[PDB]
Ligand binder design. Structure first.
Ligand code: SF4
Ligand code: SF4
Ligand code: SF4
Lengths: 196, 384, 353, 161, 127, 180
């Protein structure tokens, strides 16, 4: 029931609502209202902070509002005091030239490592964090690996007599912005979905 | 004394590095340092077909791999709207739970060794060997089995798998009890584990400790129950629980989980009748190999499928699943390409770790080892 | 040595040497037997390869050991790093000598023991302190503090129970009235099997021997899985082998000592062939102890200190005063047969509820 | 003296070592768990040390992350000298299926490899094959495809430094 | 970024490098050896990119046993990095076809590619 | 809870005196399941014609990119495969290989099919990039195995046995069961 109280709240304040018919639901808050609104979210009864998932949309075929976007996953545990089982995503877009965003560390200590990861892999700095130290990528690693402008960093696979393969020049598979090997792609290869 | 427990030595298990801030025999705070196993799947996988990724999915949590397999398969199927056959689903619950028994067998083997003594690693290893022999029988592999498919599963079960699953399903109840026999009546272990390892539910919730080391402190949340998926919705299902979260209770809870898992194995094994095994939608599933010698469309689709693969709709998707390490799930952003735009893996073992500086705070030093084994990490899941 | 002869100094020497190298081959082959016995306990198999029985593997191992490269760490005190392993072995080997495996004349003309002396247990105690000296010293000598700390845990614990052994040993001395092993043994020849009279002290002695690396404390520690044991962890070729060697000889010295004192070692009621029985009792305690090695958990030594210091040792001197009361007032020695039997009846029955 | 210079003596010590080959495991990924199976079946090997100091054979089992490399470096250096390196599995041997920023694309970069063992993970019995290799390798009983006899210890061949 | 040296000419390149490094202390520098082919060091060629952290330096593929007297040149190169206190050595594997194109790219791009692909390596293999 | 120490010991005793468990490889041959993923094999038709029409779809299917196939045109006079096309080079880097069998699964002619061998540990990297002529159905052994068996002249015995070989491996001879 706590989810309904979130959506009903978002509609009045002009917060856009994303929905896929797979059963996943988003709520995008602006940068301003984010810190406070989400404080209100833990206050709203949200026990658990599941995720902080960083997204780099640089190479995504359609445009989005800003390059990086972060998604938090807020929940209220079903086996606790009075748990709905209400779980949902809150998305916050973040400027390319401004990788700032307030931590919810005060609220959840879950926010501690996850926000650090999103700092390591994407350039995003989380405000009020106890410690933003690089987490995962080697100490002397320069930059932020999982953001799209950063090379996957492949090495040729090696065979016998002068024979090599360069994976990125070997790849049969196409990405979303890939043309394909004919004049264009239509249909299933511009994206497909079966109808149950 | 800020004691430096190294990366791989001395028996701080799975290549973690720990800065135990510690004067004396207690523990002030451990400042954990990870990242030593970072393979970088989330990037690599942006460069692999959705099929190709199914080879990269088992490889993170390598103990309970099939939970990876299951989570990823599901999130994609959802995203491209595929329909998984009932016998495939049943097999997927069997394999998931069997892989769970494997993982758990490992967890308590290592735990009992880690502080305390050597012997029971071996019996757990014997049962695990019977399980791995089951996996080899069906998938041709011990682990990292490339079996699950976005449609369903790679091929059907051979004649010999059924008889052998029973054998182990027969010994296990007596067997799981034998491990339990030693433990529940804990001789020293009681005076070793009962006090150590403090877990408040509120902080478990504050720091986000989901993974079955949560129910050992008295919060009741299981993904197979709370957010049912693969028809766990339809099984006679007991969820073991703990009183106050220490080392001991965590440790026994998973043992109970083993007989209940075995009961799910028996139950699912009962409900299994002949049929087909994966979603026949050719967009989703490569053609039958026999008619590659007859149909034009077959050959075209074969060639295409195994080179380019397929393009799911533009959309983002996620589905939650239960591993033996907790909430697991794949956040899949597809751009309508043959390869995922991005795959972020929700790593249970990664969030579960924010509570170790908490967990082993003030604990003993010999215990600081035990209190780690008791939390059951797998680093492939952590670093990743 | 009121009643017992002395072999010429050359023969005392020769016997000493025999006992040392004999203890060498002893320790190596015992390592093989524990490897395999453990393998049977955990329902696997041992090392049959590099056989025939797998019993040429200490040759192969010793051969690795030397030619291995003995490494002396800089940042380790140069003199003490070398000297440490030396000490630990020297004071371990000696004082297995005292233990009689037979009546005088039965060594083919001479003397089943090496040395006997008149003050027996005290020699043992004395030599026992000095190995521990080796332990904490090596801990220092290595001059890695990670090694030190463990060596200190070690030493504190060992020294604790090492105290325990004394107050353990008090009670049977009252009965025999001698500090000599041959006299104690013979006392068990006549009145018989001292553990019948002394049982609680038997318990605290045995368990006191758990501390001396026997396993079941083990926050001894071995470096393994903990804040490490210290002394080894910095040594390579021969020196490391020397530390391991010493701990094991101590293990079998104890497996010999337990039958020798409280039981009737050799000097069995019937058959009474001189050597075979001591070797058999040694074997018994050795095997049971191996079972202990495998089949029980650690202490943390927080508990181990609690258990020895808080429980074993008070219990040890309590029984001493009882046996002191009995021997002082001369009553019969029967009251100790009765008392020990009864205390055994208590200390067992409370387990099985 | 490194096991060398009497035809009787060196062979004798060389068996001593080959049959004694004393694995010091350096677990990384799933490969480490596939070596914990090897621990079961084992019979010149599986006593450890575990401490590096005490062992000839270093077993690199798993993906070796780039951040992890300088560590394994010193562990190898911090071994006594007559020492061998087995490289287990695809990730270790070559870059494996993860060809990228994260992972060493051959472990032979950082430590001298004696024997390589393919598979993902390799079956344990393959690792027995590799230690029999390395067994028979330090016996100087080992050859490559070019016809050449192979040296008992690689890392008797690198320049330390 | 500076570029010195020329392809396939070991002794001139070594003499020029010796000239360019000077009294620079290398304790915080990172040394990247760019080569094609992981297994065979016997017929290998080597190019080097030095990231000092305050400025970068490129040398083309003039090093290794591939060219006459080249082995001794690579060996003295690594020895010399080691003397100034360079410690962190890395090995980068490119396609043979890449090697020419790679060093004709602009400085920044080439450097990011190099740091992305490079594998930590024992300085001893080049001695 | 004192009793436990005792019972703990007891069960272990039971187990000591129970003798059996384990297999001593290579002295006792390891039992493998029939679908196991082993050394790649190229297979032939009854004619002897190779199943491989050299289409490199095994290679495209490969997540580790471990398969190199240089293609070729059949000679009318003396043919190799059943199409007009066959495989001039088939290399697999075992060190690159992850062992999915996506290659076999992609294979249209049932050419590439993973085998049973695991004793392939070898000393040199480049000895580990297998070629076609190390993988054909007729071949019995792995590289170091065969090489040892020539430098010894003592024939190859694989350390495995199976109940039977799959239909897809047809022609591949192996030690089986008590079928022999
Ligand atoms: S080779 Fe395979 S099994 Fe071994 S670490 Fe790599 S992914 Fe895991
Ligand atoms: S088994 Fe997998 S990794 Fe190996 S060649 Fe086949 S597709 Fe490539
Ligand atoms: S093995 Fe099969 S998939 Fe590979 S080239 Fe030959 S016919 Fe094609």
């Amino acid at each position: 029931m706590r989810l309904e109280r979130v959506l009903e709240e978002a509609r009045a304040k002009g917060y856009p609502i994303e929905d896929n018919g797979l059963g996943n639901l988003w709520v995008v808050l602006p940068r301003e209202r984010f810190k406070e609104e989400m404080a209100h979210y833990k206050a709203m009864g949200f026990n658990f902070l599941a995720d902080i998932v960083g997204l780099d949309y640089l190479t995504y075929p359609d445009p989005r509002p800003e390059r990086f976007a972060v998604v938090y996953e807020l929940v209220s545990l079903p086996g606790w005091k009075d748990g709905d089982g209400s779980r949902f995503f809150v998305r916050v877009y973040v400027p390319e030239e401004d990788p700032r965003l307030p931590t919810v560390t005060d609220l959840w200590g879950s926010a501690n490592f996850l926000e650090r990861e999103v700092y390591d892999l994407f350039g995003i700095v989380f405000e009020g964090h106890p410690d933003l130290r690089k987490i995962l990528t080697p100490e002397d690693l320069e930059g932020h690996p999982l953001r799209k402008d950063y090379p996957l960093g492949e090495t040729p696979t090696l065979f016998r007599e002068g024979r090599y393969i360069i994976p990125a020049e070997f790849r049969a598979a196409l990405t979303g912005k890939d043309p394909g090997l004919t004049f264009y792609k239509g249909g299933s290869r511009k994206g497909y979905r079966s109808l149950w | 004394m800020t004691l430096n427990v190294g990366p791989q030595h001395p028996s701080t298990h799975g290549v973690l590095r720990l800065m135990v801030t510690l004067s004396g025999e207690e523990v002030l705070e451990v400042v954990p340092h990870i990242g030593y196993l970072h393979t970088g799947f989330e990037k690599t996988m942006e460069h692999r077909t959705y099929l190709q990724n199914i080879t990269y999915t088992p490889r993170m949590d390598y103990l309970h791999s099939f939970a990876h397999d299951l989570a990823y398969a599901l999130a994609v199927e959802k995203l491209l709207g595929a329909v998984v056959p009932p016998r495939a689903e049943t097999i997927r619950v069997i394999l998931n739970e069997l892989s769970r028994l494997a993982s758990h067998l490992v967890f308590l083997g290592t735990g009992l060794l880690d502080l305390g003594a050597l012997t029971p690693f071996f019996y757990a290893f014997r049962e695990r060997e019977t399980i791995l022999d089951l996996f080899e029988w069906v998938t041709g592999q011990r682990f990292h089995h490339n079996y699950i498919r976005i449609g369903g599963v790679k091929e059907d079960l051979p004649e010999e798998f059924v008889p052998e699953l029973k054998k182990l399903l027969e010994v296990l109840p007596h067997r799981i009890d034998e491990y339990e026999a030693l433990f529940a009546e804990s001789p020293i272990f009681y005076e070793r584990a009962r006090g150590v390892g403090v877990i408040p539910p509120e902080v478990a919730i504050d720091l986000g400790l989901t993974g079955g080391s949560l129910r050992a402190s008295g919060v009741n949340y299981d993904v197979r129950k709370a957010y049912p998926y693969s028809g766990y919705e339809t099984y006679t299902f007991d969820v073991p629980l703990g009183e106050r979260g220490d080392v001991f209770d965590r440790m026994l809870v998973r043992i109970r989980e083993m007989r209940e898992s075995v009961k799910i194995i028996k139950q699912a094994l009962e409900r299994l009748e002949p049929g087909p095994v994966r979603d026949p939608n050719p967009q989703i599933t490569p053609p039958p190999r026999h008619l590659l010698e007859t149909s034009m469309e077959a050959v075209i689709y074969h060639f295409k499928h195994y080179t380019e693969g397929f393009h799911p709709p533009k959309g983002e998707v996620y589905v939650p699943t239960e591993s033996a390490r907790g909430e697991l799930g794949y956040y899949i952003v597809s751009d309508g390409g043959s390869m995922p735009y991005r795959v972020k893996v929700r790593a249970p073992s990664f969030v579960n770790l924010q509570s170790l500086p908490y967990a082993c705070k003030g604990e003993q030093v010999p215990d600081m080892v035990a209190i780690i084994a008791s939390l059951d990490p797998v680093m492939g899941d952590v670093d990743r | 040595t009121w009643s017992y002869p002395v072999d010429p100094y050359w023969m005392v020497a020769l016997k000493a040497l025999l006992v040392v190298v004999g203890l060498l081959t002893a320790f190596a082959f015992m390592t093989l037997i524990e490897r395999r016995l453990l393998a049977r306990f955990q329902v696997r198999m041992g090392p049959n390869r590099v056989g025939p029985f797998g019993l040429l593997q200490p040759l192969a191992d010793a051969i690795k050991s030397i030619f291995k490269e003995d490494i002396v760490v800089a940042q380790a005190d140069r003199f003490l790093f070398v000297l440490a392993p030396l000490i630990s072995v020297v004071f371990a080997l000696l004082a297995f000598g005292l233990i009689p495996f037979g009546p005088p004349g039965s060594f083919f003309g001479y003397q089943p023991w090496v040395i006997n002396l008149d003050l027996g247990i005290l020699y043992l105690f004395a030599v026992s302190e000095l190995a521990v000296y080796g332990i904490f010293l090596s801990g220092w000598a290595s001059g890695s503090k990670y090694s030190l700390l463990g060596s200190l845990r070690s030493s504190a614990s060992l020294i604790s129970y090492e105290l325990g052994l004394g107050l353990a040993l008090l009670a049977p001395v009252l009965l025999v009235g001698s500090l000599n092993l041959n006299d104690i043994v013979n006392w068990q020849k006549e009145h018989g099997w001292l553990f019948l009279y002394a049982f609680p002290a038997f318990l605290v002695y045995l368990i006191a021997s758990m501390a001396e690396a026997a396993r079941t404390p083990f926050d001894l520690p071995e470096a393994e899985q903990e804040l490490v044991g210290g002394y080894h962890t910095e040594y390579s070729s021969i020196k490391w082998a020397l530390f391991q060697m010493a701990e094991y000889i101590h293990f079998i010295t104890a497996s010999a000592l337990i039958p020798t004192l409280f039981l009737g070692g050799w000097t069995m009621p019937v058959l009474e062939v001189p050597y075979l029985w001591m070797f058999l009792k040694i074997a018994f305690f050795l095997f049971f102890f191996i079972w202990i090695r495998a089949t029980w958990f650690r202490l943390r030594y927080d508990q181990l200190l609690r258990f020895g210091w808080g429980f074993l040792f008070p219990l040890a001197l309590l029984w001493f005063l009882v046996t002191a009361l009995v021997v002082a007032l001369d009553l019969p020695r029967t009251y100790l047969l009765y008392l020990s039997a009864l205390s055994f009846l208590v200390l067992l029955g409370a387990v099985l509820y | 003296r490194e096991g060398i210079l009497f035809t009787t003596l060196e062979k004798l010590v060389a068996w001593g070592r080959s049959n004694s080959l004393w694995p010091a495991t350096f677990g990384l990924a799933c490969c480490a768990i596939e070596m914990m199976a090897s621990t079961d079946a084992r019979n010149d090997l599986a006593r450890f040390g575990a401490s590096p100091r005490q062992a000839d054979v270093m077993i690199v089992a798993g993906r070796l992350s780039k951040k992890m490399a300088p560590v394994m470096r010193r562990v190898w250096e911090q071994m006594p000298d007559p020492k061998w390196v087995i490289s287990m599995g695809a990730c270790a041997s070559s870059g494996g299926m993860f060809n990228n920023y994260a992972i060493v694309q051959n472990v032979d970069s950082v430590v001298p490899v004696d024997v390589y063992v393919p598979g993902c993970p390799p079956r344990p019995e393959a690792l027995i094959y590799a230690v029999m290799q390395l067994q028979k390798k330090v016996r100087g009983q080992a050859y490559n495809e070019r016809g050449e006899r192979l040296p008992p210890v690689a890392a008797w061949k690198r320049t330390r430094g | 970024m500076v570029r010195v040296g020329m392809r396939a000419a070991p002794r001139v390149s070594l003499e020029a490098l010796k000239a360019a490094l000077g009294g620079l202390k290398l304790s915080e520098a990172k040394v990247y050896l760019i080569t094609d082919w992981q297994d065979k060091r016997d017929q290998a060629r080597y190019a080097l990119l030095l990231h000092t952290g305050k400025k970068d330096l490129l040398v083309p593929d003039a090093f290794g046993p591939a060219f006459p007297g080249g082995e001794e040149a690579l060996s003295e190169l690594v020895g010399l990095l080691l003397a100034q206190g360079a410690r962190r050595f890395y090995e980068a594997v490119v396609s043979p076809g890449e090697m020419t194109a790679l060093l004709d790219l602009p400085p920044e791009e080439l450097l990011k590619r190099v740091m992305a692909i490079a594998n930590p390596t024992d300085p001893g293999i080049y001695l | 809870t004192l009793k436990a120490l005792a019972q703990s010991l007891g069960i272990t005793l039971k187990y000591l005196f129970s003798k059996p468990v384990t297999v001593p490889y290579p002295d006792a041959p390891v039992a493998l399941k029939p679908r196991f993923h082993g050394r790649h094999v190229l297979t032939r038709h009854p004619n002897g014609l190779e199943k491989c029409i050299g289409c490199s779809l095994c290679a495209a299917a490969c997540p580790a990119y471990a398969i190199y196939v240089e293609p070729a045109e059949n000679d009318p006079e003396n043919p190799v495969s059943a199409g007009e096309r066959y495989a001039k080079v088939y290399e697999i880097n075992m060190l690159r290989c992850i062992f999915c069998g996506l290659c076999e699964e992609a294979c249209p002619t049932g050419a590439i099919v993973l085998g049973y061998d695991f004793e392939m540990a070898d000393y040199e990297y480049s000895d580990l990039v297998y070629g076609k002529e190390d993988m054909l159905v007729d071949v019995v052994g792995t590289k170091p195995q065969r090489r040892e068996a020539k430098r010894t002249g003592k024939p190859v015995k694989v350390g495995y046995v199976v109940p039977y070989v799959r239909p897809e491996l047809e022609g591949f001879k192996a030690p089986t069961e008590g079928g022999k």
